Design a binder for this molecule. Structure first.
Ligand code: LRL
Ligand code: LRL
Ligand code: MG
Ligand code: MG
Lengths: 399, 517, 517, 399
DNA sequence: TCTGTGCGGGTGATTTTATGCCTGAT
DNA sequence: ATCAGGCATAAAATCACCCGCACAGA
């Protein structure tokens, strides 16, 4: 029969009614108070549902949540009673939470529809709702942030609201098109450096930005490369604050006539050597920090200051100026991150997620049928060895 | 194996359970209107610093503190009484702000403890006013090492502006809510004349006021409850019948519903009554509430009359309920049935005790501070022999005993010390040996240690005048508190100004209409 | 309505869940052997002051603090991992003291949170040693405003003396407990020679040690697990057959049972096996445990042989189980299968980092204190012009700016200041303009404020020699820390003494016997 | 059949087996680990049981806890199957908790046995167990305290361990038989005063101990009674610390020729009069504080001190000496009060409650059969008016 | 060649009693 | 004339899913 926890709508015509799938009574109670009563319906769920691929057909029919979901749609299950033209709602919307536990429930809900009712997915009746994640209150104005990249762009734009970088007194300042490009290039290079920490020390790579560049033609002379490596290791001992010792070596080679400097360090009583061979000089990683250092070696003389709106403070480095500019904008700021639909008022959930004039929604489609069911067997199947190799391979791609 | 009788084992065990429920679980006090469950929750929220103008805080912290420190009785019952303070259809004046999902009027339950945020309301700070000035008594915990107040020093008359509902062993209570600006006027009318009758007190307080408006139908049951303590009233919903401009079709619109009435159950009961063929003339029934308010639409057939169908729904459905008034509360530790005049007179006595206990604490603190400031001001006029006596001492203990050995001459402060005449600034415990005798000053052991802890930056010419101004301000504040404690009409003059300030800050308007039959 | 493919929606959602369980829920770290659940519980018990030599505290306070401040994941799962640290049949070295009802070996559950009291054990204070000296990193909460340590600065090698048992997505772990006095000897043998082989490291650590004694039957599966990471061992109970002096009756007495084995289920399984007629020769079965230990009595019939019945129960009942060893742990943020030598070598590196991070903090603190004490000792030899300059100033700000305007002459402290030569006590951030130049002293803005906050009781003749002795002690402590940071053999000499002290304080004896087949 | 939560014993003969009734799995788990396995059995209960008197016979048989309790005993219920010689245990012991909720469960358990199985109660098979309430640790020794009176006697005896009351220098001290009698008489008078607070002020009654006594023959003269009331109200203003004013009156009467003084006070601006008539002078309450004041008006001159073991501190009043003697003994003391059987170790529960050599136990009997069932109807019946009058009457007897 | 079971750290839900006064349904 | 329900503080319990690895039973 009809389920007891289903809150139906007043519309009886299909292709004008919608069904929402939520994650318990906490989200279900907030969704019912802020919906449209004429053509929207809510159905709560009781937690993690059964895995269809790992279970047989006999265990599937005896489950309680699956039977409720089958009798809510009204189309049917199996092959003898699978007329798909008796569907009651022409829009199925999944509105699980924004945690990592909500991502697991969406995976089981997606593998239930594809493995049991494929024609509903092929005819385009399944949607995915997108609630916001951040709420930012800046004094008197509130905004909603979709994802982390929009949060980064928002905090960069609120840091660069007032950008008057004065290189020296009685000189024009830089603002607008130059500061944003410099900040973006510096952030890209700093993001590139943090992925290179597994092979080189972090303090050595940041020193190479302000050092003069080394070309391929300078590797044929001993004096230039030994002067470059001596000037590199001279100031690393000067600015050291954690108690480390730095040395250097020449490493004269006979075949493939070159001279490759060697950097030696001792951190906790352990000595390691980091060679700078021909692969590092001609590589693409040294080119980006060389092009960054062309516009940074210089540009800051004595008596230099920055002003955002009214506050003047002298700086001696670009990093100190950027840190003072970032830290000033985080005074009257409050950031709240949502981890469930029960944390929102019913007025807030309607205006951001369920209003059909100001909402964003996805529509699932199938591209290749042969390549789709091969991925469902690997990730959701009984065997554990292709799953472990699939997880381990994608971890190397990010690093 | 010593034998016992079954008659005395039953009597001894049952009376121990019955007295604990009456005094320690239900039946709120008459002076603040709170059960022991509510007082510990409000005190734990006050200790944490969960103010009304600060950020929100998760309810799990508050429930954990209440369970782990003060209230050892369960976990789910503590969260149930928090959400009753935050729902606007449950209390007339709410005490918890709340944000998230706290249920609905259709019977929806609240969310879990991990998803809701709470903080104190602005009106809840008037209940805990002047708590740290020794105005109430404190008791121990179940295992010691913590102290809980016995009663709250409230400034707002509770148990009338809100109500009570509890079941005990042998008795129960049921009190309706009222209006704040009317009960404050009744309290002021009691202060102006203590022989005010029930009829003279009822022209300021006409009747109860509910947070869900509606209509009270009749005046006979209100006057009986205010004289005796028991009575019965009737609550009626607000509805009307409207016709169409072109056709003769009629509809019934419901705007308000009575107190403690669910809406979904009412709609289901009306639909069941139509289906069972007990009410005739109804063809459709919807629910279009939206955001502007409440609206329920009932369709009337063409061959029926809309007035008769509306009159049939009053006597069959839950569009008219009954309320049974029964006022019992704890007075001097024992239950008692009370009328309207007893509740008003038990509030002014509490206010008198709180003010006259605050004044003594303030006076003692002021006199101790003036006693310290006198010895601080004396020692700055004899800087060189003080420094010489300190520098010629091996240990600070011998330097302390060398200060009280000889009297110190005055100078440039005699005009200050002569203004504080008639011993108005001396502490009450001070011996007559010390103080100002002839033209010399005699120090104590407490005053000698304050000189040895004096900072080196107090020798400038700026802070000495600050000390003199602080001494002058302390003398004026000492005089005013003695003038308050001297008489009783001044004491009653202080109380009226606070009540008028409360009426000005938290005024409201009447929602419920009182008519006749 | 922007469309998406079902291939990329499935891949993006499943990898976000799988990486969070691996790194943030299960699979403990290799440096301290703790999951993220255990670290927050121990840190919250450390913050409250729940020490081992103080009074007991209710578990409801600890669970409420953990839920409300650090761990937002449920309530019943937090209490389940607390009682696993207090049961003596569950952990080899317990971390929580506990008092009340914490379950039994027959399968009884623990009591509620309102009836049990807990406090930290003495061995749990060695895991959080030197936490407030900047030796580890700190991370944020789910909503900010609180800080949690990233890893613990432990002195005791965990993940070997206790074990691990967790299930992740794609992998799982299973590590047996060991003995403390053997793993400390293996750690010292690694320090004396870094090229020690597996066979040379196995003469100090022969095998696992269980808290329920019993017998390990075989040596082949132990050597395979210490070289590769995977292996299988067998655990056998201890029992014997005794005869009567007069009659020829025989009985079987069981003294010990294997690891993770319930006793009531074992007795029920033996009784069911007798009832179904699958084991012959058993006539009675009781359970007489008492307080001296464990004793299970099985009666043998007269026509049967007691050795054959005992050998039949090993291969049919749960008197012999199997253990599958599989060692995975997080190393630099990624899972890895490890052998015995990798776990030992990952502990000494952690100890090196902790000691060399503690030394820098202590050196900086000592140099700042000596810098303050120099300016405190200088100003006591020029008392009269300091007092005159303070008294002839209107405001303390002008008095502060008047102190740094002119140099101050020395006297009676030049012999003290010449002993701190070669700039060994100067702060690293100090400008070369200030300090001691010629026979004069130059003050800073920080040193000038410390003179203005000097108490009046410091002018006696006692505390000046105390300041000089404190300055001498600070110079010696500055010299020793530089001698530690200078070389590496001194650094390895500091580490060995702490390990020997831990072995002396928390030594034990082997409970489990290792035999051959 | 046999219940699943019952833990049976190894003894099969009745009149050697015992059954314990406890209050859940928390107490049941602690009771099973510290019992005697040969002849003791444990049966847990699930909370508050049904009220037998307020419920009909049809609702009683459908309950789950009552059916478990019936099938555990094995005797039977009703009249057709009520052979009482098939009882399996000849000892039924009730071991509920020491709260006020544990007293309610014992009342329902007692009214189940008397109203349904009266022959078991009449033949003497029902017992009541008595666990201890307090655990006191004095440095290195632990003791268990039964009730509050034993706690009061213990703290009085630990306060009066060293009692050397010196009235003056170069005088013999009082110790032993006199100090205990003085302390007991003073505590009895102070307990009598606290019950009289509803009719007289507390500060006035404590002043009458040190005042000279007033006889019946002194009420016939004006000068003596006005001097007595003036000397009474003179020092009440002197020792006042809460801001009150005291006055007096003469109240000359014509018939029954006497002179009764009147005491007037004003506390918070409210004035009340407390007459001291002929009933108060000849009453038994004034006699006790008169006999207390015969041995206290005096006995303390200047230069008086007390010493308990080694500490000497001068005092000026008996109350100050008693307070200093009490407060010194509460330094190395820790008191823990039990509120359930799950707070005790199984070793502690055996040695104090369940060991048949060092336990205390009651045995319920019936004195009058007519007077017993009349009390069960009043307290546990349907009507609420005799219950309310029974509760209110016993509250007046204590006050 | 299948089918349950148990180990630990996560998600979600649910029923039965005492005690008093008033109503509706049978 | 009898029975059941709904109003606020107190007691006590229990069951269904995802995730890998080894073993007993059928
Ligand atoms: O419980 S107290 O003594 N009274 C609450 C009343 C009782 C009944 C009334 C009420 C109950 C339910 C609804 C309701 C339920 C469902 C749907 N539609 C409405 C409405 C009102 N709410 C109390 C609790 C907590 C804090 C209190 C603080 N000062 C006074 C009383 C307090
Ligand atoms: O879960 S942990 O990773 N290992 C516990 C082992 C797993 C299995 C083992 C065990 C389990 C059950 C019994 C048992 C059960 C019933 C009857 N008779 C015995 C015995 C042992 N106990 C862990 C938890 C909490 C704190 C930990 C601290 N340092 C290490 C591991 C810790
Ligand atoms: Mg969720
Ligand atoms: Mg209990």
């Amino acid at each position: 029969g009809l389920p007891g926890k289903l809150a139906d709508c007043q519309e009886r015509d299909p292709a004008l009614s919608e069904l929402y799938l939520v994650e318990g009574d906490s989200a279900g109670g907030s969704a019912k108070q802020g919906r449209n009563r004429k053509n929207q319906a809510i159905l709560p769920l009781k937690g993690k549902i059964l895995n269809v691929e790992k279970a047989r057909f006999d265990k599937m029919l005896s489950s309680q949540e699956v039977a409720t979901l089958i009798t809510a749609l009204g189309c049917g299950i199996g092959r003898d009673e699978y007329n798909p033209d008796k569907l009651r709602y022409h829009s199925i919307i999944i509105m699980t939470d924004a945690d990592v536990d909500g991502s697991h429930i969406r995976t089981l809900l997606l593998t239930f529809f594809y493995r049991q009712m494929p024609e509903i997915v092929e005819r385009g009746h399944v949607y995915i709702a997108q609630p916001p994640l951040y709420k930012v209150k800046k004094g008197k104005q509130e905004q909603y942030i979709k994802d982390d990249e929009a949060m980064d762009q928002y905090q960069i734009s609120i840091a660069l609201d007032g950008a008057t970088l004065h290189t020296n007194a009685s000189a024009p300042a830089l603002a607008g098109e130059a500061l944003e490009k410099l900040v973006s290039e510096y952030n890209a290079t700093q993001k590139m450096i943090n992925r290179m920490e597994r092979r080189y020390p972090k303090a050595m790579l940041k020193e190479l930005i302000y050092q003069p560049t080394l070309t391929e033609a300078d590797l044929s002379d001993e004096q230039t490369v030994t002067r470059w490596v001596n000037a590199l290791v001279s100031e690393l001992n000067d600015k050291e604050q954690h108690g480390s010792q730095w040395k250097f070596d020449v490493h004269t080679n006979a075949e493939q006539n070159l001279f490759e400097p060697i950097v030696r360090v001792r951190t906790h009583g352990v000595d390691t050597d980091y060679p700078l061979d021909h692969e590092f000089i001609t590589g693409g990683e040294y080119r980006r920090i060389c092009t960054l250092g062309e516009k940074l070696r210089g540009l800051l003389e004595e008596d230099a200051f920055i002003e955002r709106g009214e506050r003047r403070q002298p700086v001696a480095s670009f990093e100190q100026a950027l840190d003072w500019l970032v830290k000033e904008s985080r005074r009257g700021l409050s950031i709240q991150r949502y981890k469930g639909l029960g944390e929102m008022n019913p007025e807030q959930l309607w205006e951001t997620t369920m209003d059909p004039e100001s909402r964003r929604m996805l529509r699932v489609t199938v591209k290749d049928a042969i390549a789709a069911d091969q991925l469902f067997t690997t990730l959701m199947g009984d065997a554990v060895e292709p799953r472990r190799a699939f997880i381990e391979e994608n971890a190397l791609k990010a690093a | 194996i010593t034998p016992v009788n079954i008659e005395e084992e039953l009597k001894s065990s049952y009376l121990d359970y019955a007295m604990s429920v009456i005094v320690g679980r239900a039946l709120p006090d008459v002076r603040d209107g709170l059960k022991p469950v509510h007082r510990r929750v409000l005190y734990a929220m006050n200790v944490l610093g969960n103010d009304w103008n600060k950020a929100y805080k998760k309810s799990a912290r508050v429930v954990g503190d209440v369970i782990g420190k003060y209230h050892p009785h369960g976990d789910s019952a503590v969260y149930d009484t928090i959400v009753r303070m935050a729902q606007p259809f449950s209390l007339r004046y709410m005490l918890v702000d709340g944000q998230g999902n706290f249920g609905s009027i259709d019977g929806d339950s609240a969310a879990a403890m991990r998803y809701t945020e709470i903080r104190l309301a602005k009106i809840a700070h008037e209940l805990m006013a002047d708590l740290e000035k020794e105005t109430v008594d404190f008791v121990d915990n179940y295992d010691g090492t913590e102290k809980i107040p016995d009663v709250m020093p409230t400034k707002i008359p509770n148990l009338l502006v809100n109500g009570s509902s509890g079941i005990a062993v042998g008795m129960a209570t049921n009190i309706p809510p009222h209006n704040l600006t009317e009960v404050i006027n009744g309290c002021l009318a009691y202060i102006d004349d203590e022989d005010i009758s029930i009829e003279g007190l009822m022209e300021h307080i006409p009747g109860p006021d509910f947070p869900t408006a509606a209509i009270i139908n009749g005046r006979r049951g209100i006057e009986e409850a205010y004289r005796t303590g028991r009575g019965k009233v009737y609550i009626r919903a607000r509805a009307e019948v409207e016709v169409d401009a072109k056709t003769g079709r009629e509809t019934i619109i419901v705007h308000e519903i009575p107190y403690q009435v669910n809406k979904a159950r009412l709609i289901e009961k009306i639909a069941e009554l139509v289906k069972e063929k007990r009410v005739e003339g109804i063809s459709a029934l919807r629910d279009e509430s939206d955001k502007d308010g409440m609206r329920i639409v009932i369709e009337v057939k063409r061959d029926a009359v809309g007035e008769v169908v509306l009159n049939n729904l009053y006597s069959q459905t839950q569009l008219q309920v009954s309320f049974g008034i029964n006022m019992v509360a704890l007075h001097h530790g024992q239950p008692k049935i009370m009328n309207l005049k007893d509740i008003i007179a038990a509030f002014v006595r509490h206010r008198r005790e709180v003010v006259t206990r605050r004044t003594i604490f303030e006076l003692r603190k002021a006199r101790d501070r003036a006693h310290i400031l006198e010895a601080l001001a004396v020692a700055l006029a004899n800087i060189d022999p003080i420094i010489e006596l300190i520098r010629h001492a091996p240990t600070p203990a011998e330097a302390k005993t060398a200060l009280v050995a000889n009297p110190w001459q005055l100078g440039n402060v005699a005009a200050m010390l002569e203004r504080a005449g008639d011993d108005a600034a001396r502490p009450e415990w001070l011996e007559p040996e010390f103080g100002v005798r002839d033209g010399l000053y005699y120090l104590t052991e407490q005053q000698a240690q304050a000189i040895l802890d004096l900072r080196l930056q107090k020798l400038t010419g700026l802070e000495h005048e600050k000390l003199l101004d602080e001494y002058k301000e302390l003398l004026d504040q000492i005089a005013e508190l003695l003038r308050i404690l001297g008489s009783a009409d001044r004491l009653m003059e202080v109380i009226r100004e606070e009540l008028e300030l409360v009426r000005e800050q938290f005024g409201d308007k009447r929602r419920t209409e009182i008519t006749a039959n």
